[PDB]
Amino acid sequence: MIKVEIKPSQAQFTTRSGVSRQGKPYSLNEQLCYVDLGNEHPVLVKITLDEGQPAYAPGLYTVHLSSFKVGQFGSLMIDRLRLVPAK
Amino acid sequence: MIKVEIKPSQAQFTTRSGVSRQGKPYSLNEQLCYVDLGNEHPVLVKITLDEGQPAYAPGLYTVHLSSFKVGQFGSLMIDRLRLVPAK
């Protein structure tokens, strides 16, 4: 439950394409947000979109708890930025 | 909130120590807490503790935003999980 803002400027996503072996292409797409991390000042964080799921419209979003995950040696983590209209 | 709690049996830490592959010394203390990330039940999570830092004491907690950093391409990561008391 973090403030995320997408300003109109940020509405289109941004690419970083690619490939690995057995069936593993890295052809990455990213969109950007301003995240207020407590501070009076916003941070440009990046959102990595997963296949078939799209760039968020402009507006105000909260970070959704499924955005967090528990890793290999038991640490909690942002796996991917997950947003909701929630307010 | 990222709802967190340390029960009586969890109010303490374990030390793991050995050596880093840049041949550097570690002596890391770890503690378990229950995190409510949604799901239907409490997921168990590992707080790594800072040098000096006493293991937190039983109770209700919430995650403090100082736990989230940003680097490289606007990449958000949890740095340390710093919990503060509930309200």
PDB file of C-alpha atoms in Angstrom:
ATOM      1  CA  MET A   1       0.000   0.000   0.000  1.00  0.00           C
ATOM      2  CA  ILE A   2       2.219   2.552  -1.594  1.00  0.00           C
ATOM      3  CA  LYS A   3       1.306   5.606  -3.785  1.00  0.00           C
ATOM      4  CA  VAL A   4       1.894   4.988  -7.479  1.00  0.00           C
ATOM      5  CA  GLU A   5       1.125   7.627 -10.062  1.00  0.00           C
ATOM      6  CA  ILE A   6       1.221   7.138 -13.856  1.00  0.00           C
ATOM      7  CA  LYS A   7       1.342  10.686 -15.483  1.00  0.00           C
ATOM      8  CA  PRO A   8      -0.018  10.758 -19.209  1.00  0.00           C
ATOM      9  CA  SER A   9       3.554  11.007 -20.477  1.00  0.00           C
ATOM     10  CA  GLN A  10       4.205   7.469 -19.026  1.00  0.00           C
ATOM     11  CA  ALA A  11       1.123   5.737 -20.697  1.00  0.00           C
ATOM     12  CA  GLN A  12       3.137   3.851 -23.258  1.00  0.00           C
ATOM     13  CA  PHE A  13       5.481   1.105 -22.315  1.00  0.00           C
ATOM     14  CA  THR A  14       9.211   0.750 -23.325  1.00  0.00           C
ATOM     15  CA  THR A  15      11.094  -2.229 -24.705  1.00  0.00           C
ATOM     16  CA  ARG A  16      14.281  -4.257 -24.052  1.00  0.00           C
ATOM     17  CA  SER A  17      14.067  -7.401 -26.370  1.00  0.00           C
ATOM     18  CA  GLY A  18      15.911 -11.045 -26.265  1.00  0.00           C
ATOM     19  CA  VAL A  19      16.786 -14.934 -26.166  1.00  0.00           C
ATOM     20  CA  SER A  20      17.679 -18.118 -24.161  1.00  0.00           C
ATOM     21  CA  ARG A  21      17.890 -21.820 -24.944  1.00  0.00           C
ATOM     22  CA  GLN A  22      15.205 -24.574 -24.168  1.00  0.00           C
ATOM     23  CA  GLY A  23      12.374 -22.134 -24.792  1.00  0.00           C
ATOM     24  CA  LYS A  24      13.453 -18.948 -22.945  1.00  0.00           C
ATOM     25  CA  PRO A  25      13.303 -15.551 -24.864  1.00  0.00           C
ATOM     26  CA  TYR A  26      13.832 -12.403 -22.821  1.00  0.00           C
ATOM     27  CA  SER A  27      11.994  -9.773 -25.068  1.00  0.00           C
ATOM     28  CA  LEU A  28      11.139  -7.354 -22.184  1.00  0.00           C
ATOM     29  CA  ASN A  29       8.667  -4.437 -21.969  1.00  0.00           C
ATOM     30  CA  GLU A  30       8.672  -1.872 -19.166  1.00  0.00           C
ATOM     31  CA  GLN A  31       6.482   1.123 -18.185  1.00  0.00           C
ATOM     32  CA  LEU A  32       7.292   3.871 -15.685  1.00  0.00           C
ATOM     33  CA  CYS A  33       5.630   5.253 -12.586  1.00  0.00           C
ATOM     34  CA  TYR A  34       6.300   7.850  -9.877  1.00  0.00           C
ATOM     35  CA  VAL A  35       6.298   6.089  -6.487  1.00  0.00           C
ATOM     36  CA  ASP A  36       6.088   8.067  -3.340  1.00  0.00           C
ATOM     37  CA  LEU A  37       8.158   6.176  -0.904  1.00  0.00           C
ATOM     38  CA  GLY A  38       6.975   8.116   2.232  1.00  0.00           C
ATOM     39  CA  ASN A  39       9.113  11.165   1.296  1.00  0.00           C
ATOM     40  CA  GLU A  40       7.467  14.584  -0.002  1.00  0.00           C
ATOM     41  CA  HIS A  41       9.248  13.541  -3.243  1.00  0.00           C
ATOM     42  CA  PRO A  42       8.407  11.006  -6.073  1.00  0.00           C
ATOM     43  CA  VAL A  43      10.612   8.253  -7.473  1.00  0.00           C
ATOM     44  CA  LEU A  44      10.626   7.027 -11.078  1.00  0.00           C
ATOM     45  CA  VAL A  45      10.313   3.267 -10.654  1.00  0.00           C
ATOM     46  CA  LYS A  46       9.863   0.807 -13.433  1.00  0.00           C
ATOM     47  CA  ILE A  47       7.025  -1.697 -13.931  1.00  0.00           C
ATOM     48  CA  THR A  48       7.743  -4.920 -15.800  1.00  0.00           C
ATOM     49  CA  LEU A  49       4.806  -6.135 -17.734  1.00  0.00           C
ATOM     50  CA  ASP A  50       4.167  -9.856 -18.228  1.00  0.00           C
ATOM     51  CA  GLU A  51       3.030 -11.264 -21.518  1.00  0.00           C
ATOM     52  CA  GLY A  52      -0.504 -10.294 -22.757  1.00  0.00           C
ATOM     53  CA  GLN A  53      -0.963  -7.967 -19.767  1.00  0.00           C
ATOM     54  CA  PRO A  54      -0.671  -4.246 -20.775  1.00  0.00           C
ATOM     55  CA  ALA A  55       0.498  -0.713 -19.924  1.00  0.00           C
ATOM     56  CA  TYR A  56      -1.633   0.961 -17.233  1.00  0.00           C
ATOM     57  CA  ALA A  57      -3.796   3.944 -18.212  1.00  0.00           C
ATOM     58  CA  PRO A  58      -2.663   7.329 -16.605  1.00  0.00           C
ATOM     59  CA  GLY A  59      -3.827   7.811 -13.011  1.00  0.00           C
ATOM     60  CA  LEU A  60      -3.460   6.892  -9.319  1.00  0.00           C
ATOM     61  CA  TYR A  61      -2.716   3.336  -8.270  1.00  0.00           C
ATOM     62  CA  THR A  62      -1.772   1.518  -5.053  1.00  0.00           C
ATOM     63  CA  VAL A  63       0.739  -1.321  -4.963  1.00  0.00           C
ATOM     64  CA  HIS A  64      -1.145  -4.524  -4.704  1.00  0.00           C
ATOM     65  CA  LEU A  65       0.084  -7.155  -2.252  1.00  0.00           C
ATOM     66  CA  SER A  66       0.503  -9.911  -4.868  1.00  0.00           C
ATOM     67  CA  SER A  67       3.361  -7.732  -6.051  1.00  0.00           C
ATOM     68  CA  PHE A  68       5.299  -9.322  -3.100  1.00  0.00           C
ATOM     69  CA  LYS A  69       6.692 -12.842  -2.857  1.00  0.00           C
ATOM     70  CA  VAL A  70       8.794 -15.144  -0.656  1.00  0.00           C
ATOM     71  CA  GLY A  71      12.061 -16.184  -2.223  1.00  0.00           C
ATOM     72  CA  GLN A  72      14.548 -18.944  -2.064  1.00  0.00           C
ATOM     73  CA  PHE A  73      16.359 -18.451   1.249  1.00  0.00           C
ATOM     74  CA  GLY A  74      13.048 -17.079   2.812  1.00  0.00           C
ATOM     75  CA  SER A  75      13.338 -13.308   2.049  1.00  0.00           C
ATOM     76  CA  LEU A  76      10.130 -11.357   1.068  1.00  0.00           C
ATOM     77  CA  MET A  77      10.367  -9.479  -2.241  1.00  0.00           C
ATOM     78  CA  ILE A  78       8.944  -7.196  -4.936  1.00  0.00           C
ATOM     79  CA  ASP A  79       8.619  -9.867  -7.627  1.00  0.00           C
ATOM     80  CA  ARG A  80       6.753  -7.524  -9.998  1.00  0.00           C
ATOM     81  CA  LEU A  81       4.985  -4.208  -9.627  1.00  0.00           C
ATOM     82  CA  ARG A  82       1.298  -4.948  -9.290  1.00  0.00           C
ATOM     83  CA  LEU A  83      -1.207  -2.007  -9.375  1.00  0.00           C
ATOM     84  CA  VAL A  84      -4.765  -1.298  -8.491  1.00  0.00           C
ATOM     85  CA  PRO A  85      -7.126   1.531  -8.601  1.00  0.00           C
ATOM     86  CA  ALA A  86      -8.146   1.178  -4.916  1.00  0.00           C
ATOM     87  CA  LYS A  87      -9.552   4.389  -3.374  1.00  0.00           C
TER      88      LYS A  87
ATOM     89  CA  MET B   1      -0.802  -2.347   5.607  1.00  0.00           C
ATOM     90  CA  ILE B   2       2.031  -4.998   5.148  1.00  0.00           C
ATOM     91  CA  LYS B   3       0.598  -6.429   8.292  1.00  0.00           C
ATOM     92  CA  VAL B   4       3.446  -8.165  10.341  1.00  0.00           C
ATOM     93  CA  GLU B   5       3.601 -10.014  13.623  1.00  0.00           C
ATOM     94  CA  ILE B   6       6.165 -11.576  15.905  1.00  0.00           C
ATOM     95  CA  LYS B   7       4.671 -14.207  18.260  1.00  0.00           C
ATOM     96  CA  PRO B   8       6.390 -15.153  21.637  1.00  0.00           C
ATOM     97  CA  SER B   9       8.138 -18.215  20.077  1.00  0.00           C
ATOM     98  CA  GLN B  10       9.504 -16.034  17.272  1.00  0.00           C
ATOM     99  CA  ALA B  11      10.901 -13.172  19.496  1.00  0.00           C
ATOM    100  CA  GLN B  12      14.556 -13.971  18.857  1.00  0.00           C
ATOM    101  CA  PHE B  13      17.193 -14.647  16.195  1.00  0.00           C
ATOM    102  CA  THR B  14      19.698 -17.345  14.851  1.00  0.00           C
ATOM    103  CA  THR B  15      23.163 -16.434  13.799  1.00  0.00           C
ATOM    104  CA  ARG B  16      24.605 -17.850  10.527  1.00  0.00           C
ATOM    105  CA  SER B  17      28.317 -17.158   9.926  1.00  0.00           C
ATOM    106  CA  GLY B  18      31.014 -18.212   7.450  1.00  0.00           C
ATOM    107  CA  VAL B  19      32.713 -16.722   4.423  1.00  0.00           C
ATOM    108  CA  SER B  20      31.720 -14.774   1.370  1.00  0.00           C
ATOM    109  CA  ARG B  21      33.207 -15.822  -2.057  1.00  0.00           C
ATOM    110  CA  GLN B  22      35.124 -12.442  -2.146  1.00  0.00           C
ATOM    111  CA  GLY B  23      36.646 -14.009   1.054  1.00  0.00           C
ATOM    112  CA  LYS B  24      34.894 -11.628   3.361  1.00  0.00           C
ATOM    113  CA  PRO B  25      33.417 -12.425   6.835  1.00  0.00           C
ATOM    114  CA  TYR B  26      29.690 -12.686   7.570  1.00  0.00           C
ATOM    115  CA  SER B  27      27.753 -13.030  10.818  1.00  0.00           C
ATOM    116  CA  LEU B  28      24.110 -12.571   9.920  1.00  0.00           C
ATOM    117  CA  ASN B  29      21.181 -12.726  12.419  1.00  0.00           C
ATOM    118  CA  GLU B  30      17.881 -13.840  11.201  1.00  0.00           C
ATOM    119  CA  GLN B  31      14.404 -13.798  12.780  1.00  0.00           C
ATOM    120  CA  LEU B  32      10.974 -15.139  11.660  1.00  0.00           C
ATOM    121  CA  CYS B  33       7.806 -13.213  11.583  1.00  0.00           C
ATOM    122  CA  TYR B  34       4.396 -13.842  10.045  1.00  0.00           C
ATOM    123  CA  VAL B  35       3.570 -11.561   7.145  1.00  0.00           C
ATOM    124  CA  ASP B  36       0.033 -10.911   5.797  1.00  0.00           C
ATOM    125  CA  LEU B  37       0.468 -10.577   2.138  1.00  0.00           C
ATOM    126  CA  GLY B  38      -3.172 -11.502   1.634  1.00  0.00           C
ATOM    127  CA  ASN B  39      -3.412 -15.148   0.407  1.00  0.00           C
ATOM    128  CA  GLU B  40      -5.831 -16.790   3.006  1.00  0.00           C
ATOM    129  CA  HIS B  41      -3.179 -17.640   5.539  1.00  0.00           C
ATOM    130  CA  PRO B  42      -0.068 -16.043   7.106  1.00  0.00           C
ATOM    131  CA  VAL B  43       3.147 -16.560   5.192  1.00  0.00           C
ATOM    132  CA  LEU B  44       6.263 -17.077   7.277  1.00  0.00           C
ATOM    133  CA  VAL B  45       9.204 -14.627   6.549  1.00  0.00           C
ATOM    134  CA  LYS B  46      12.867 -14.161   7.509  1.00  0.00           C
ATOM    135  CA  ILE B  47      14.049 -10.748   8.917  1.00  0.00           C
ATOM    136  CA  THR B  48      17.877 -10.379   8.441  1.00  0.00           C
ATOM    137  CA  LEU B  49      19.126  -8.065  11.219  1.00  0.00           C
ATOM    138  CA  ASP B  50      21.535  -5.210  11.011  1.00  0.00           C
ATOM    139  CA  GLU B  51      24.830  -5.110  12.991  1.00  0.00           C
ATOM    140  CA  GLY B  52      24.204  -4.509  16.718  1.00  0.00           C
ATOM    141  CA  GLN B  53      20.316  -4.707  16.080  1.00  0.00           C
ATOM    142  CA  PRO B  54      18.269  -6.609  18.750  1.00  0.00           C
ATOM    143  CA  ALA B  55      15.722  -9.031  17.440  1.00  0.00           C
ATOM    144  CA  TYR B  56      12.212  -7.444  17.626  1.00  0.00           C
ATOM    145  CA  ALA B  57       9.972  -8.208  20.547  1.00  0.00           C
ATOM    146  CA  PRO B  58       6.480  -9.870  20.454  1.00  0.00           C
ATOM    147  CA  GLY B  59       3.673  -8.105  18.842  1.00  0.00           C
ATOM    148  CA  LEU B  60       1.807  -6.504  16.153  1.00  0.00           C
ATOM    149  CA  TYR B  61       3.869  -4.636  13.568  1.00  0.00           C
ATOM    150  CA  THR B  62       3.663  -3.019  10.166  1.00  0.00           C
ATOM    151  CA  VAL B  63       6.504  -2.713   7.526  1.00  0.00           C
ATOM    152  CA  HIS B  64       8.174   0.745   7.344  1.00  0.00           C
ATOM    153  CA  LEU B  65       8.818   2.299   3.873  1.00  0.00           C
ATOM    154  CA  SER B  66      12.618   2.570   4.610  1.00  0.00           C
ATOM    155  CA  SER B  67      12.613  -1.076   3.666  1.00  0.00           C
ATOM    156  CA  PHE B  68      12.266  -0.254  -0.092  1.00  0.00           C
ATOM    157  CA  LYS B  69      15.148   1.032  -2.212  1.00  0.00           C
ATOM    158  CA  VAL B  70      15.505   1.897  -5.958  1.00  0.00           C
ATOM    159  CA  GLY B  71      18.477   1.633  -8.283  1.00  0.00           C
ATOM    160  CA  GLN B  72      19.638   0.864 -11.881  1.00  0.00           C
ATOM    161  CA  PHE B  73      16.755   1.313 -14.365  1.00  0.00           C
ATOM    162  CA  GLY B  74      14.334   2.594 -11.707  1.00  0.00           C
ATOM    163  CA  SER B  75      14.292  -0.816 -10.058  1.00  0.00           C
ATOM    164  CA  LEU B  76      12.459  -1.074  -6.767  1.00  0.00           C
ATOM    165  CA  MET B  77      13.805  -3.779  -4.302  1.00  0.00           C
ATOM    166  CA  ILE B  78      13.236  -4.354  -0.552  1.00  0.00           C
ATOM    167  CA  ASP B  79      16.579  -3.501   0.985  1.00  0.00           C
ATOM    168  CA  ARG B  80      16.311  -4.553   4.685  1.00  0.00           C
ATOM    169  CA  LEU B  81      12.737  -5.224   6.140  1.00  0.00           C
ATOM    170  CA  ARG B  82      12.432  -2.579   8.854  1.00  0.00           C
ATOM    171  CA  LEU B  83       9.329  -3.113  10.875  1.00  0.00           C
ATOM    172  CA  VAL B  84       7.799  -0.410  13.129  1.00  0.00           C
ATOM    173  CA  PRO B  85       5.003  -0.808  15.746  1.00  0.00           C
ATOM    174  CA  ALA B  86       1.304  -0.885  15.041  1.00  0.00           C
ATOM    175  CA  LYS B  87      -0.737   2.200  15.890  1.00  0.00           C
TER     176      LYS B  87
END
